[PDB]
Amino acid sequence: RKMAFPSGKVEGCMVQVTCGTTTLNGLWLDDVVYCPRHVICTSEDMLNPNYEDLLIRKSNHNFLVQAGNVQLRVIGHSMQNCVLKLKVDTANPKTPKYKFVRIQPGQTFSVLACYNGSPSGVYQCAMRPNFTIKGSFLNGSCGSVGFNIDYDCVSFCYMHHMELPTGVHAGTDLEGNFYGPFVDRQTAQAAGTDTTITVNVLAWLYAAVINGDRWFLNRFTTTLNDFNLVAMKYNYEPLTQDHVDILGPLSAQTGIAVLDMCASLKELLQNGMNGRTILGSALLEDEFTPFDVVRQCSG
């Protein structure tokens, strides 16, 4: 089951940011509010914005930052890649311990979908290999963030900026660098062909083994290079060394070597399921990370 992180620590950081009649969400940490820089655009500006020129025309007093109906006075501003940073005169007393991280494809995170600075729902997303996410985002959702929580610390990894023709979503890290080859312009853009997240499928197979569903374990092994070359013919991602390493704990727990599991997956790709199921499904699941399998099979 997809399980999100408890959202309270992030809810306490959500604000709204308005420039003119353009409103979206911002993230208030200490005395800085982070938000998408296209808040400075009119609808017509978005077709072909010159952000440097648009921002030179702005001053601190052109930005309306609100926590609910309570205005936070803006005392400084700057642009960092595709994010605006607004210094405000109040440090957020609900600021959690936090970090800004840039995630890899395959990593999952919780999204707190917000409208007008108000949280509406929380759900789990996986960053696809084509650097899109299958979100649920409507008009006004920009500036909603994705995050993971480890012990005390919220790791912010995603800020929402746009939807693509195919219905999927694109955005940046909290330094304003897009995931993928997208730009914050209201122009026709296309997500490239997606692929299956191999490291997560392997995590799912380990989860199946942990729960006693292990008919697919075969008697073979493989090399990582051989496996990578075969898997790409099935539109699966190649594994990295870091992938092998993050499967370590599940490999240790089950006693199944990573490359033996790779050989088992290879046989599933080459010969199919043959009518059988795994964890009550004939589809291989690729949106649970090794950490997610551990998270859920533990507490």
Ligand X SMILES: *[C@@H](O)[C@H](C[C@@H]1CCNC1=O)NC(=O)[C@H](CC(C)C)NC(=O)OC[C@H]1C[C@H]2C=CC[C@H](C2)C1
> Residues interacting with its own copies, by CB under 8 A?
1-9, 11-12, 112-113, 115, 119-123, 125, 134-141, 163, 167-169, 211-212, 277, 280-283, 295-296, 298-299
With respect to ligand X, which residue has the nearer C-beta, 93 or 165? 165
Answer for the pair 67, 15: CB distance below 8 angstroms, yes or no. yes
With respect to ligand X, which residue has the nearer C-beta, 72 or 142? 142
Residue 103 contact among ligand X, its own copies, none, beta carbon within 5 to 8 Å by kind? none
* Residues binding ligand X (CB under 6 A): 24, 38, 46, 137-139, 141-142, 161-165, 169, 184-186
Residue 115 contact among ligand X, its own copies, none, beta carbon within 5 to 8 Å by kind? its own copies
How many whole angstroms separate alpha carbon 148 and alpha carbon 41? 30
With respect to its own copies, which residue has the nearer C-beta, 79 or 122? 122
Q: Which helix (H) or strand (E) holds 171?
A: strand 169-172
Q: Which helix (H) or strand (E) holds 258?
A: helix 258-271
In DSSP terms, 148 is beta-bridged to 155
> What are the tokens at 166?
């195919």
Q: Which residues contact 57 (CB under 8 A, 6 or more apart)?
A: none
Work out how close the CB of 264 gets to ligand X at its nearest, in angstroms, rounded to a whole number. 26
Choose, from 19, 38, 125, 243, the residue flagged as catalytic. Answer: 38
Secondary structure (DSSP) of 106-128: T-EEEEEEEETTEEEEEEEEE--
Choose, from 19, 142, 157, 262, the residue flagged as catalytic. Answer: 142
Nearest to 35 by CA among 4, 81, 71: 81
142 in active site? yes
38 in active site? yes
With respect to ligand X, which residue has the nearer C-beta, 77 or 161? 161
Active site residues: 38, 142
